[PDB]
Amino acid sequence: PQITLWKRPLVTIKIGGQLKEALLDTGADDTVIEEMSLPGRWKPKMIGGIGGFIKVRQYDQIIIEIAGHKAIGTVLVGPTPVNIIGRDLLTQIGATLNF
Amino acid sequence: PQITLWKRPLVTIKIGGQLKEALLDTGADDTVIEEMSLPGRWKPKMIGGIGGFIKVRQYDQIIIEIAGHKAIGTVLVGPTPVNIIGRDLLTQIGATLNF
Numbered sequence: 001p002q003i004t005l006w007k008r009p010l011v012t013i014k015i016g017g018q019l020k021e022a023l024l025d026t027g028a029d030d031t032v033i034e035e036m037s038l039p040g041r042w043k044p045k046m047i048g049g050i051g052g053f054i055k056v057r058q059y060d061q062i063i064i065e066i067a068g069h070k071a072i073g074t075v076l077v078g079p080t081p082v083n084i085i086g087r088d089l090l091t092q093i094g095a096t097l098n099f
Numbered sequence: 100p101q102i103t104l105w106k107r108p109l110v111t112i113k114i115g116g117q118l119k120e121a122l123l124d125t126g127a128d129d130t131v132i133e134e135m136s137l138p139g140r141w142k143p144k145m146i147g148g149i150g151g152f153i154k155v156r157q158y159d160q161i162i163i164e165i166a167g168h169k170a171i172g173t174v175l176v177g178p179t180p181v182n183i184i185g186r187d188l189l190t191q192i193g194a195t196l197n198f
């Protein structure tokens with residue numbers, strides 16, 4: 001589909017057996033999801049943005065369905081203000097920027 | 100053009116007559132440029148992102164060329180990690196997300 005940018009590009013995603021609303025972010029290298037009790041192994045990581053860094057838990061090989069599109073990859077979990085789908089998963093669903 | 104996301108969606112912009120590199124950020128409401136001298140009056144403003152809030156100088160109706168495309172609108176100038184083009188100007192040049 002095509003998503004205009006008048007409003008924030010939000011879509012429904014499915015992760016860890018839960019449905020959430022996430023922002024498609026071309027300016028994000030990684031995918032960061034709100035605090036979740038995901039099962040399995042993880043490793044500590046620090047991700048940064050506009051006002052600084054936040055501590056997150058890195059889970060590899062996480063299956064996420066983005067707007068009906070399945071993808072598998074690394075998902076960072078932590079105190080993010082919003083669920084962010086980064087380029088790491090956007091590339092997997094074949095998302096492009098067009099103008 | 101059509102921009103895939105295997106690499107950061109960076110483009111060349113022209114602001115204040117100076118060329119700079121900026122990231123097309125669909126996850127940014129506003130356009131934030133690194134500290135620079137810009138012709139025009141401004142008012143203090145504060146924006147937030149991952150990590151927190153930062154103080155920026157808000158310049159209104161700023162002429163800016165993004166990858167050969169022209170936009171005229173609000174440009175926030177402050178200590179951002181990288182120059183980012185938000186939805187405010189992305190919509191002006193007709194950018195959409197497609198998958």
Ligand SMILES: CCCC[C@H](NC(=O)[C@H](C)NC(=O)[C@H](CCC(=O)O)NC(=O)[C@H](Cc1ccccc1)NC[C@H](CC(C)C)NC(=O)[C@@H](NC(=O)[C@@H](N)CCCNC(N)=[NH2+])C(C)C)C(N)=O
Nearest residue numbers: 027028029048049126127128129144145146147148149180
């Ligand atoms: C005058 C303005 C008034 C309006 C003002 N608006 C805002 O504050 C709104 C909500 N902010 C935003 O939309 C900001 C961008 C700034 C802006 O647009 O102003 N967006 C953002 O900050 C979005 C995430 C987000 C979206 C919505 C809400 C909260 C957060 N992230 C943008 C950001 C771009 C990056 C190049 C700087 N990406 C990231 O932060 C991602 N990080 C990464 O991709 C890292 N790997 C990058 C390298 C890290 N290293 C380093 N920094 N040294 C992260 C999501 C994993 C307000 N105060 O409400």
